[PDB]
Amino acid sequence: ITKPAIRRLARRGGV
Amino acid sequence: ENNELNAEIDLQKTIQEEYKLWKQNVPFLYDLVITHALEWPSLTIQWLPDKKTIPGTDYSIQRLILGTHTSGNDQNYLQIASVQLPNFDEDGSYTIEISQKIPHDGDVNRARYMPQKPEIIATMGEGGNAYIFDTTCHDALTTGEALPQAVLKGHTAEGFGLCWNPNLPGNLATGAEDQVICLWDVQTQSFTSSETKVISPIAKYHRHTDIVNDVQFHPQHEALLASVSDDCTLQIHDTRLNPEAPKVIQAHSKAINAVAINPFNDYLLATASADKTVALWDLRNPYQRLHTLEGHEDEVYGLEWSPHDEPILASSSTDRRVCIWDLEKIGEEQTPEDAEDGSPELLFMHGGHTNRISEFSWCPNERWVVGSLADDNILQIWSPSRVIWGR
């Protein structure tokens, strides 16, 4: 999971 | 009642489920997460500007202004906490100490240090009084913390609006539930006396028709004061003129809880509203709403621009989240799936708190570090991963 997966995770707050 | 109790049960279940998932994802989302439980919940937080490095250790010591709201029986306190922070540089053993506990009259609704003299702290307190403290001072006879250097008498109900003029030393503005804005001239000049000084306003504005929630001076224009209110208006005041009339903007159709002027620009101002959005405004053309930032799921209460990066803005909500927006992504295209998560400029959501956010504060001594408080006594100091904000 590179940068783009991490960036959707971040917008969703990892929740 | 049967729907209220079981709805509150289900909410707590959701919170516990989402907190467990958040913890699992922290190693991908953060470069740092420090958590400290406080003896009392705090309504307010602000980083002081000092940083103490220790040669031969990999951490620095920084400090936070905090308060209490026992709001019944117990004595309240303006507090200063000393926290270790790691020393970052480019490509979880850290302590807290409550180093100063200053008796305070009533809840500490808001507290701010004077930019030009950080040892001077103003607070909003009992009944609407504002108070001034010198945190380098002591009791007349003992090493105990000093009583207020001054009390500021003018508001007739309690308030949460408080800000210093970064361009006029000792100039202060307050807003309160009496719908009034008071301006003050605090002369630290005068704190050479054996008694608390009583101060009266130099000016009062009766321009709002409901609770005044927030006030801020323009970072670079000393005569310019913004104010927002439950009457759903943003007002721009010229403190030279006489209460002439300010600029009034119907910025949202629900209560406006916070305002924040960009520290790097002359013109860019943001507002946060009970309508769940943050709106952007150009002071040169203030009647045009530039954009609306969507992503919160409940009223937005906190709002603060990054002190290091012009396009970076943060907000906080009773949805228990702190969001970080990157205005450089204004205009970027996104799919309707991504749009369910929020506007394109939504960069980061902090999901580490398990109750309503009280307040948060950007760390002025480190890049991309935030201190945030929630109503369940939890202080968190955190940094999103450089994977997310870098380049």
Residue numbers in the entry:
A (entry chain B): 30 to 44
B (entry chain A): 12 to 102, 118 to 269, 272 to 419
Give sentences copied directly from the paper behind this entry.
Centromeric chromatin in fission yeast is distinguished by the presence of nucleosomes containing the histone H3 variant Cnp1CENP-A. Cell cycle–specific deposition of Cnp1 requires the Mis16–Mis18–Mis19 complex, which is thought to direct recruitment of Scm3-chaperoned Cnp1/histone H4 dimers to DNA. Current structural and biochemical data suggest a model in which Mis18 provides the principal link to the centromere, whereas Mis16 is responsible for recruitment of the Scm3–Cnp1–H4 complex, which allows Cnp1–H4 dimers to be inserted into chromatin as a prelude to complete nucleosome assembly.
The ordered N terminus of helix of histone H4 (H4α1, residues 28–41) sits in a concave pocket on the outside of the β-propeller fold formed by the Mis16 N terminus and a small insertion into blade 1 of the propeller. Overall, the structure of S. pombe Mis16 and its interactions with histone H4 closely resemble those of the homologous Schizosaccharomyces japonicus Mis16 and the human RbAp46/48 proteins and exhibit a highly conserved interface, which has been extensively described by others. Our structures of Mis16–H4α1 and Mis16–Mis19C show that the C-terminal α helix of Mis19C (Mis19α2) binds the same site on Mis16 as the histone H4α1 helix. A peptide corresponding to histone H4α1 (residues 27–50) was found to bind to Mis16 with a KD of 29 nM, consistent with previous studies.
